[PDB]
């Protein structure tokens, strides 16, 4: 339940029963031969795993530093790493005899992934989404509707991601017997941070095998963007015991760390409790304060407790990249490698480019390209302008 | 050169020189050890081949007849099969010493694939696109520019795909010494129909191996959508010599075959010469306009190798309306969690009707040629 001082089950007593049932089911099914057969089958044939590890040769040469590989989570079904978690939890839900899935979403990407997994497995899907995010993400709302999911606008509180999570928790207490609450990052009360990390760790396991095959050795650095932290945990976790491999999580620097408009919880937040977990949050008064990022998936005031832990024990380092830096990396990757990255993933690219220039040419960097940029074209069109 | 009577190389003297140079280069490089090491490496690490073969279990059980499998070309980098052709030809261009790629596009999808491949190999990319299509494909135009390509609006003639092809050809005769013309389907003069089919046949070879692993046998029917015909040939070509395997191409029925608003060249068109080849074209007489809700299927002509297959009766060709493809778009999204391209939805729509007639022991493979992210704006307006 804890990662050092972070994690826990900071929830009302009505949630402890449901969380214990989930913890017991997961402990049984995680190593069950039939569950993993079906999971791997769906990941292979429906999601398209494994994804490749791609040597960004032009980008490497242009910077003239370390070798930059991209783990291509942009190629999984739906365009983001979120699918790995959505399938895992939706299948777990089916094996527990649940008929309905609920989920929070802010950017809409998790909402879409949950709706896809729900469609696949013949399950009912309701997505809680803050009204401000509904307005901002008209196309993802439409994807969810096409996929057969029902989107429920959340009008309470700040009308955004944190409020959707709380409304989803309120639903789950009343409906847990037939409903699984499908959380979209390594956040929330135990066992969710563990379950989501476990279902994303396939990224790192593939990456480790692919890099040893491609280069005969472990990478020097692994770089991943961090919103809540699931894609980073997925690629990090199989290298945690490899002491030589530096892990770098990249948070949303927004308009700048001193601008007050960012989502860098580990960098500038404080220890706090929200959504069932003890972790780092941006807060003023005790009030969990609004976050910002040009990348909608990084727009969350908190962070997963396992990242707080890895930062505390200094196993991983955490940095911030601004909106402008990510936007330059989005354009740069597109025209240098013909890969349009997600704006979230562009933060990790942006940092990797700075980091490669310093490092030696014999050394190796893996960047987790967590998603594709199709979803972000409207945004980039507005902000970068038509060209 | 030819496929039965169809195909050929009916171009002026200014095109004979570059086309012959391309045939020699293609002969040289198609089986070269170094060329294939680079191609398979790019298809694996950058494009993400192989793509899976998916058993659509809920769709199959719902319909209650044949097992429907989907060849998941929607998962290739870029979201459509065209990437296969774009990499192969762009690589060929690099091996021939070319620094520039030109290409036609109407839907924008070949334009994006060529832009991506050009970015990948460090080549200049100019995309010829009709002004009517430039106006209807804002986001694909943005994608191309984002990928470092330039988009040259074509204002001659009907301001769409056929005219853009013509302008690229006029460019290529002037610039062939350093430019490769990257054609986007199995059309145009020899050797383009052969080259494009060869670069897409990876689809069919994977699908064959995959269905043998899953089911222990070849499929009873393969169903693919047909615009120019590159995704259909890709999946058809490895099964041509397997006599038991039925091949079904699905053209755009549009507003209806009786309506005059469709792109079913094989079904309702006449034989003629255009863009240096003998094939089927919709005719008024002269070549007339085409229409489909799926922009990728919106072309009045069709590949000569499909004309050949239709004649020998090796492959059967059918049409599916806008309405029918739309219903299949929604059905596959809701039932399987896969949002198909509207082009691909034509293939799904026909495979669904066909599955109903067939038995539960029998197998259909549908080429799911692309994903539907690009079509959401169009589907939103109709919805
Ligand atoms: N906001 C993103 C990612 C996300 C989902 N759930 C979260 C919980 C915490 C942090 C981030 C997330 C999305 O909905 O796609
Ligand atoms: N119109 C589609 C497909 C296409 C490209 N070139 C073609 C030539 C003939 C027929 C169709 C095509 C596109 O541009 O993406
Ligand atoms: Na955060
Ligand atoms: Na046609």
Residues whose CB is less than 8 angstroms from the CB of residue B66 and which lie 6 or more positions away in sequence, other chains included: B60, B220, B221, B354, B355, B358, B359, B360, B362, B363, B364
In terms of C-beta density within 10 A (0-12 exposed, 13-18 middle, 19 or more buried), how is residue A290 classed? Answer: middle
A50 CB near ligand 1 (under 6 Å)? no
Query: Are A337 and B119 a contacting pair at CB < 8 A?
Result: yes
Integer Cα distance of B230 and B81 in angstroms: 9
Resolution stated for this PDB structure, in Å: 2.0
β-strand partners of A371: A80
Ligand 1 atom nearest the C-alpha of A228 is: 10
Residues whose CB is less than 8 angstroms from the CB of residue A278 and which lie 6 or more positions away in sequence, other chains included: A5, A6, A7, A8, A10, A271, A272, A305
Integer Cα distance of B346 and B332 in angstroms: 12
Q: How far is CA B353 from CA B221, B246, B295, B339, in A?
A: 13, 15, 23, 19
Query: Are B119 and A335 a contacting pair at CB < 8 A?
Result: yes
Integer Cα distance of A205 and B134 in angstroms: 44
Among candidate residues B344, B346, B338, B339, the one with its CA nearest the CA of residue B369:
B344
Helix (H) or strand (E) holding A146: helix A138-146
DSSP A277-346: EEEEE-B----BPPP--SSGGG--S---HHHHHHHHTTSEEEEEEEHHHHHHHHHHHHHHHS--B-HHHH
Query: Are A334 and B54 a contacting pair at CB < 8 A?
Result: no
Helix, strand, coil percentages for chain A (3-state, nearest 5): 50, 20, 30
Name the experimental technique: X-ray
DSSP state of A225: E
* Alpha carbon of B172: minimum distance to chain A alpha carbons (Å): 23
A 10 A CB-CB count for A373 gives 24
Structure tokens at B28: 């040289």
Integer Cα distance of B348 and A279 in angstroms: 48
In chain A, breaks (C-N over 2.5 A) are found after 284
Mutual angle of helices A109-120 and B322-336, in 10-degree steps = 90
> What is the distance in A from the centroid of ligand 4 to the CA of B299?
5
Asked whether the beta carbons of A266 and A291 are under 8 A apart, the reply is: no
Structure tokens at A129: 């989404």
A 10 A CB-CB count for A130 gives 26
What domains can you pick out in chain A, each with its CATH number?
3-47+83-200 (3.40.50.1100), 48-81+201-387 (3.40.50.1100)
A277, A103, A376, A305: CA torsion to nearest 10? 10
Integer Cα distance of A368 and A72 in angstroms: 7
- The ligand whose atoms approach the alpha carbon of B269 most closely is 4
Q: How far is CA A21 from CA A39, A40, A159, A188, B87, in A?
A: 21, 24, 30, 16, 50
Integer Cα distance of A375 and B339 in angstroms: 14
Q: How many CA atoms lie within 13 A of B335 on its CB side?
A: 19
- Tokens 């039939």 -> residue: A34
A 10 A CB-CB count for A362 gives 8
Residues whose CB is less than 8 angstroms from the CB of residue A213 and which lie 6 or more positions away in sequence, other chains included: none
Annotated catalytic residue: which of A71, A94, A104, A291?
Answer: A104
β-strand partners of B365: B69, B222
Largest CA distance in chain B: 57
Structure tokens at B116: 């991506």
Integer Cα distance of A85 and A230 in angstroms: 9
Annotated catalytic residue: which of A67, A71, A82, A98?
Answer: A82
In terms of C-beta density within 10 A (0-12 exposed, 13-18 middle, 19 or more buried), how is residue A296 classed? Answer: buried
Residue B279 annotated in active site: no
A18, A22, A24, A29: CA torsion to nearest 10? 160
A 10 A CB-CB count for B82 gives 31
Residue of chain B whose alpha carbon sits nearest to that of A150: B334
Asked whether the beta carbons of A291 and A262 are under 8 A apart, the reply is: yes
Q: How far is CA B171 from the centre of its chain?
A: 23
Structure tokens at A20: 């214990």
Integer Cα distance of B281 and B301 in angstroms: 4
Asked whether the beta carbons of A104 and A164 are under 8 A apart, the reply is: yes
Among candidate residues A215, A237, A236, the one with its CA nearest the CA of residue A225:
A236
DSSP state of A367: E
A127, A132, A133, A135: CA torsion to nearest 10? 100
Asked whether the beta carbons of B187 and B228 are under 8 A apart, the reply is: yes
Integer Cα distance of B73 and B88 in angstroms: 16
Q: How many CA atoms lie within 13 A of B198 on its CB side?
A: 16
Query: What 3-state DSSP class applies to A217?
Result: coil
Asked whether the beta carbons of A125 and A114 are under 8 A apart, the reply is: yes
Q: How far is CA B351 from CA A146, B68, B247, in A?
A: 21, 8, 12
Query: What 3-state DSSP class applies to A137?
Result: coil
Structure tokens at A104: 């929070």
Query: What 3-state DSSP class applies to A13?
Result: helix
Query: Checking DSSP bridges between strand B363-368 and strand B315-321, what pairing results, if any?
Result: unpaired
In terms of C-beta density within 10 A (0-12 exposed, 13-18 middle, 19 or more buried), how is residue A358 classed? Answer: exposed
Three-state secondary structure readout of chain B: CEECCEECCCCCHHHHHHHHHHHHHHHHHCCCHHHHHHHHHHHHHCCCCCCCEEECHHHHHHHCCCEEEEEEHHHCCCCECHHHHHHHHHHHHHHCCCCEEEEEECCCHHHHHHHHHHHHHCCEEEEEEEHHHHHHCHHHHHHHHHCCCEEEEECCCCCCHHHHHHHHHHHHHHHCCCEEECCCCCCCCCCHHHHHHHHHCHHHHHHHHHHHHHHCCCCCEEEEECCCCHHHHHHHHHHCCCCCCEEEEEEEEECCHHHCCCCCHHHHCEEEEECCEEEEECECCCECCCCCCCHHHCCCECCHHHHHHHHHCCEEEEEEEHHHHHHHHHHHHHHHCCCECHHHHHHHHHHHHHHHHCCCCCEEEEEECEECHHHHHHHHHHC
Q: Among A85, A108, A110, which residue has the most ligand 1 atoms within 8 Å of its CB, making it the best to mutate?
A: A110
Integer Cα distance of A73 and A371 in angstroms: 6
Three-state secondary structure readout of A166-212: HHHHHHHHHHCCCEEECCCCCCCCCCHHHHHHHHHCHHHHHHHHHHH
Q: How far is CA A379 from CA A151, A373, A376, in A?
A: 22, 10, 5
Asked whether the beta carbons of A57 and B49 are under 8 A apart, the reply is: no
A 10 A CB-CB count for B284 gives 9
Chain B residues within 8 Å of chain A (Cβ atoms)? 44-46, 48, 51-55, 58, 72, 75, 77, 79, 115-120, 122, 139, 142-143, 145-148, 330, 333-339, 373-374, 376, 379-380
User: Cα angle at A279 between A276 and A280, to 5 degrees?
Assistant: 130
Q: How far is CA B42 from the centre of its chain?
A: 20
Integer Cα distance of B294 and A141 in angstroms: 22
Asked whether the beta carbons of A364 and A66 are under 8 A apart, the reply is: yes
Question: Peptide bond preceding B191: is omega within 30 degrees of 0, i.e. cis?
Answer: yes
Integer Cα distance of B168 and B188 in angstroms: 12
Structure tokens at B275: 């863009």
A 10 A CB-CB count for B170 gives 14
Sign of the CA dihedral running B149, B370, B81, A77: positive
- CB-proximal residues (5 Å) to ion ligand 4: B 263, 265, 299, 302
Backbone phi, then psi, for B379, in 5-degree steps? -70, -30
Residues in chain A: 387
Integer Cα distance of B371 and B83 in angstroms: 13
User: Cα angle at A89 between A165 and A9, to 5 degrees?
Assistant: 50
DSSP state of A44: I
Structure tokens at A91: 């299948």
Query: What 3-state DSSP class applies to A252?
Result: strand
Structure tokens at A352: 């990797």
Integer Cα distance of B273 and B155 in angstroms: 23
Integer Cα distance of B383 and B372 in angstroms: 15
Query: What 3-state DSSP class applies to A138?
Result: helix
Integer Cα distance of B353 and A301 in angstroms: 50
Asked whether the beta carbons of A103 and A114 are under 8 A apart, the reply is: yes
Integer Cα distance of A349 and B317 in angstroms: 47
* Alpha carbon of A9: minimum distance to chain B alpha carbons (Å): 33
Structure tokens at A59: 């980008």
Integer Cα distance of B326 and A94 in angstroms: 30
Mutual angle of helices A323-337 and B109-121, in 10-degree steps = 90
A 10 A CB-CB count for B356 gives 11
Integer Cα distance of A260 and A289 in angstroms: 10
Sign of the CA dihedral running B91, B97, B99, B103: negative
Integer Cα distance of A159 and A168 in angstroms: 13
Q: How far is CA B255 from the centre of its chain?
A: 21
Question: Peptide bond preceding A275: is omega within 30 degrees of 0, i.e. cis?
Answer: no
Helix (H) or strand (E) holding A223: strand A221-225
A 10 A CB-CB count for B58 gives 17
């Amino acid at each position: 339940m804890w990662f050092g001082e972070f994690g826990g089950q900071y929830v009302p007593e009505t949630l402890i029963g449901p969380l214990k049932e989930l913890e017991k089911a997961y402990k049984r099914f995680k190593d069950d031969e039939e569950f993993n057969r079906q999971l791997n089958y769906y990941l292979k044939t429906w999601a398209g795993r494994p994804t490749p590890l791609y040597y960004a040769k032009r980008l490497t040469e242009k910077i003239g530093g370390a070798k930059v590989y991209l783990k291509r989570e942009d190629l999984v079904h739906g365009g983001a790493h979120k699918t790995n978690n959505a399938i895992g939890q939706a299948l777990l839900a089916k094996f527990m005899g649940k008929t309905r899935l609920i989920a929070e979403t802010g950017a809409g990407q998790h909402g879409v992934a949950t709706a896809m997994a729900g469609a696949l497995l013949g399950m009912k899907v309701d997505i809680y989404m803050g009204a401000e995010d509904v307005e901002r993400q008209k196309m993802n709302v439409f994807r969810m509707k096409l996929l057969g999911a029902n989107v429920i606008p959340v009008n309470s509180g700040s009308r955004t991601l944190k409020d959707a999570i709380n409304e989803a928790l309120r639903d789950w207490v009343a409906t847990f017997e037939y409903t699984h609450y499908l959380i979209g990052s390594v956040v929330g009360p135990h066992p969710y941070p563990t379950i989501v990390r476990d279902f994303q760790s396939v990224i790192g396991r593939e990456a480790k095998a692919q890099i040893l095959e491609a280069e005969g050795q472990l990478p020097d650095v692994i770089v991943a963007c961090v919103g809540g932290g699931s894609n980073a945990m997925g690629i990090f976790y199989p290298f945690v015991n490899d002491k030589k491999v530096k892990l770098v999580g990249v948070e949303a620097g927004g308009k700048g760390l001193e601008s007050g408009k960012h989502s860098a919880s580990l960098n500038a937040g404080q220890v706090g409790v929200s959504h069932g977990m003890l972790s780092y949050f941006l807060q003023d008064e005790g009030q969990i304060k609004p976050s910002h990022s040009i990348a909608p998936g990084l727009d969350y005031p908190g962070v997963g407790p396992e990242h707080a832990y890895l930062k505390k024990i200094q196993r991983a380092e955490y940095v911030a990249v601004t909106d402008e830096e990510a936007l330059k990396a989005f354009h740069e990757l597109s025209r240098t490698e013909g890969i349009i990255p997600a704006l979230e993933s562009a933060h990790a690219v942006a940092y990797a480019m700075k980091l490669a220039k310093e490092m030696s040419r014999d050394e190796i960097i893996i960047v987790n390209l967590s998603g594709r940029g199709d979803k972000d074209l409207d945004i980039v069109l507005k902000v970068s302008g038509n060209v």
